[PDB]
Amino acid sequence: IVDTCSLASPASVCRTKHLHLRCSVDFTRRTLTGTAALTVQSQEDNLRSLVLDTKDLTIEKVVINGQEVKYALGERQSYKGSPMEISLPIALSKNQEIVIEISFETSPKSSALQWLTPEQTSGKEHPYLFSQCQAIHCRAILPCQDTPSVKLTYTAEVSVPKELVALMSAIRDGETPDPEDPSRKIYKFIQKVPIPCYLIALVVGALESRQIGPRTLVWSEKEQVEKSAYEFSETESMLKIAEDLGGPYVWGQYDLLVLPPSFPYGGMENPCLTFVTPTLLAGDKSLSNVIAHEISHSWTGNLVTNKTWDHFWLNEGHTVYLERHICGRLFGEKFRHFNALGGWGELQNSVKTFGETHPFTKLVVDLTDIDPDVAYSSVPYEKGFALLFYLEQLLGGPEIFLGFLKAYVEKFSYKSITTDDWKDFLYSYFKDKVDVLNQVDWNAWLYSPGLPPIKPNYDMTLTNACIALSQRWITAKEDDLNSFNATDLKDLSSHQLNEFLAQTLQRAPLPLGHIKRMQEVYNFNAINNSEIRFRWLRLCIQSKWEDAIPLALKMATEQGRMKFTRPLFKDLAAFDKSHDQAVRTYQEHKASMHPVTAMLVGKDLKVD
Numbered sequence: 001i002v003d004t005c006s007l008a009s010p011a012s013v014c015r016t017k018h019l020h021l022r023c024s025v026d027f028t029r030r031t032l033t034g035t036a037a038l039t040v041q042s043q044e045d046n047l048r049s050l051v052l053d054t055k056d057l058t059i060e061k062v063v064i065n066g067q068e069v070k071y072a073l074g075e076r077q078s079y080k081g082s083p084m085e086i087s088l089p090i091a092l093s094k095n096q097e098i099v100i101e102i103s104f105e106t107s108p109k110s111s112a113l114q115w116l117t118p119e120q121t122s123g124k125e126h127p128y129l130f131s132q133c134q135a136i137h138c139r140a141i142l143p144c145q146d147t148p149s150v151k152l153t154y155t156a157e158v159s160v161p162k163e164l165v166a167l168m169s170a171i172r173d174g175e176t177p178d179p180e181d182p183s184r185k186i187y188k189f190i191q192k193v194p195i196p197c198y199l200i201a202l203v204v205g206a207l208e209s210r211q212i213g214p215r216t217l218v219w220s221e222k223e224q225v226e227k228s229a230y231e232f233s234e235t236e237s238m239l240k241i242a243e244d245l246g247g248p249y250v251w252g253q254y255d256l257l258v259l260p261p262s263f264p265y266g267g268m269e270n271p272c273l274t275f276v277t278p279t280l281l282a283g284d285k286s287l288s289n290v291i292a293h294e295i296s297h298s299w300t301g302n303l304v305t306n307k308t309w310d311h312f313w314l315n316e317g318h319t320v321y322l323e324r325h326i327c328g329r330l331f332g333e334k335f336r337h338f339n340a341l342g343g344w345g346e347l348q349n350s351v352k353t354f355g356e357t358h359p360f361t362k363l364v365v366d367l368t369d370i371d372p373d374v375a376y377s378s379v380p381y382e383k384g385f386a387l388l389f390y391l392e393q394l395l396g397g398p399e400i401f402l403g404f405l406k407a408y409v410e411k412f413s414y415k416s417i418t419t420d421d422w423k424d425f426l427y428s429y430f431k432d433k434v435d436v437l438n439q440v441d442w443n444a445w446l447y448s449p450g451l452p453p454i455k456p457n458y459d460m461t462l463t464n465a466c467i468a469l470s471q472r473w474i475t476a477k478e479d480d481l482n483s484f485n486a487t488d489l490k491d492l493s494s495h496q497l498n499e500f501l502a503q504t505l506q507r508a509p510l511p512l513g514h515i516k517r518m519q520e521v522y523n524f525n526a527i528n529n530s531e532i533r534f535r536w537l538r539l540c541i542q543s544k545w546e547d548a549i550p551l552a553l554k555m556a557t558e559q560g561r562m563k564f565t566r567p568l569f570k571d572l573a574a575f576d577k578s579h580d581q582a583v584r585t586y587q588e589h590k591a592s593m594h595p596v597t598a599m600l601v602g603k604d605l606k607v608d
């Protein structure tokens with residue numbers, strides 16, 4: 001089984017066992033410079049060369065056995081970067097290991113990295129750097145077999161200006177002054193658990209920490225520490241539930257890092273150090289499902305890993321399934337059903353947007369010649385979850401299916417697997433229920449586009465009030481608008497308010513007068529909850545409310561979570577009155593945006 005996103009030698013040829021990274025972070029040049037020493041095991045007899053992924057990397061030299069060796073960089077292959085073939089000085093027998101030390105430098109335009117000026121930070125005095133390797137950006141940091149089919153341990157020494165702090169997806173292993181430069185510090189790191197290289201992460205900035213649990217510190221700039229400690233105070237209780245469901249947490253520490261606003265995702269499950277968007281800081285812990293999600297990846301994703309990106313649903317579907325169980329344990333089974341039903345709504349939205357026959361609406365996708373960043377959507381999350389929730393209901397309930405989940409994590413821990421491996425184990429675990437399993441339309445679920453062939457059963461208790469209010473608004477005529485008022489919202493949680501808006505957004509546009517009334521009576525303009533504000537602004541823009549233009553533009557640009565920034569820009573571009581402003585704002589902000597976000601927004605806008 002071939003990873004069509006990687007140009008490196010496959011796991012069947014050789015396997016990286018370990019990376020020792022020794023580098024220096026240069027904020028003046030916006031480069032990372034150093035050596036990556038790869039311990040590689042031959043899987044073949046008489047192995048004489050091998051190939052590594054690179055992207056925008058400057059290679060100085062490659063050293064084996066203390067001597068320089070021949071290598072060559074192939075022609076760049078778009079988003080895949082350039083393959084690097086290395087000639088081994090002596091042929092290797094099967095299972096023989098050697099160390100290959102590559103001296104390299106990154107480009108300032110590394111798609112893995114965002115370099116922030118002091119003014120793009122909270123403190124305004126120091127610069128800031130962060131990485132994001134998933135799916136295939138590790139190659140834009142260092143030469144590697146950039147495929148999740150290979151797992152390696154790592155150690156790193158990172159030299160940074162002494163007033164700044166380095167963190168990695170690893171256990172902190174001490175700090176010292178840089179022996180070769182008084183103005184610099186070296187931070188050391190150890191990751192003892194084998195990981196796919198997409199989980200390598202690095203932050204450098206003016207970071208402070210606060211403890212919030214027996215194995216959790218929150219890290220951020222000083223201005224955000226207090227708020228973050230409170231927002232994420234459920235972390236330990238969630239880790240406890242996660243361990244009950246998934247087995248031992250094997251990674252030692254579970255720290256959180258709250259990034260600056262340009263961070264492109266809700267979170268990223270970097271082992272030992274989850275990265276999260278500051279757009280989670282609602283002030284009431286209401287967006288903590290994102291933390292439950294990142295915690296869950298400690299089992300589904302980081303222990304059991306997708307062998308190629310075609311099988312990404314394995315990572316995300318199971319993680320959302322565990323995420324919803326954590327939240328269901330904390331807040332009740334009716335709440336789990338409410339979230340599950342909301343997720344089905346998001347799947348409807350994704351399918352409608354792509355088109356019901358689009359290949360990216362397939363559960364298992366074929367990424368040959370497709371940039372994974374372009375293919376990325378809610379489909380693998382929600383169609384994946386829908387499959388598992390359907391299977392749960394078919395096979396006798398949540399207690400039974402959780403038994404399978406834990407056994408699946410156990411079976412495939414430290415490994416990389418395909419959808420077939422998963423299905424084979426499902427059939428093994430439930431061998432006494434194979435007749436029921438054979439009733440599943442596997443070909444439809446796994447390989448067909450569109451909505452799943454069957455929708456699960458959802459408890460409606462919490463959803464009813466949201467649908468009822470949304471329907472009141474949708475069917476209202478002008479002479480009904482007077483009946484609405486602030487008391488409509490009195491018994492709705494923030495989650496229900498969000499769902500009301502999601503329900504209403506699906507029927508957008510509404511009449512402009514309706515939207516004006518909704519602001520008049522509910523004052524959604526005052527809500528800072530990022531999810532609620534996002535849906536409200538989309539509703540306003542799609543319903544042609546000019547007053548909403550500056551609000552939408554401000555939210556699109558003052559944070560950069562792609563979930564929010566991409567649809568806000570797209571809506572603003574689709575609205576005749578804001579179209580020119582949207583394009584102009586993008587052009588102006590482009591240079592200081594995250595490189596992946598810049599790329600996708602440009603594509604969305606048909607710009608450049």
Ligand SMILES: O=C(O)C1CCN(CCOc2ccc3[nH]ccc3c2)CC1
Pocket residue numbers: 134135265266267268269293294309312316372373374375376377
């Ligand atoms: O799921 C999470 O925890 C979030 C969202 C997804 N994340 C980064 C997404 O990047 C990827 C990774 C893998 C992918 N396969 C296809 C598209 C694609 C995009 C990390 C944080």
Ligand SMILES: [Yb+3]
Pocket residue numbers: 477479480
């Ligand atoms: Yb009427």
Ligand SMILES: [Zn+2]
Pocket residue numbers: 293297315316319
């Ligand atoms: Zn995830």
